[PDB]
């Protein structure tokens with residue numbers, strides 16, 4: 001079980017590291033093909049290809065992230081992240097709470113993201 005936990009954590013490290021690297025090949029491999037992605041604040045729901053498309057656009061805006069905390073609670077993990085994006089020369093700063101559902105290799109089958117824009 002500790003191995004299970006340790007593997008999930010390592011994968012979330014890979015996720016966020018790949019995000020800062022801009023390596024979407026690595027992101028694609030961590031997500032189940034039938035996974036659903038939820039924007040909690042807008043109630044919008046996306047499939048994997050739609051989610052990755054949005055990631056691509058954000059990476060084009062210099063999206064960078066830093067993980068602040070990881071809490072393991074099917075494995076459910078809550079990650080708090082600070083993120084920045086540069087949009088038409090104006091940087092925007094965000095605090096995001098990402099709650100993942102991993103299902104067994106372990107794959108992400110669901111993410112709910114609460115996104116708050118903090119102001120630069």
Ligand SMILES: C[C@]12CCC(=O)C=C1CC[C@@H]1[C@@H]2[C@@H](O)C[C@@]2(C)[C@H]1CC[C@]2(O)C(=O)CO
Nearest residue numbers: 054055058065081083085094096098113115
């Ligand atoms: C561009 C985005 C969605 C659209 C929006 O109005 C603001 C942002 C900035 C933060 C981004 C977010 C999504 O892309 C999901 C991201 C990457 C998040 C930072 C971490 C995030 O929740 C994830 O890493 C999810 O796996």
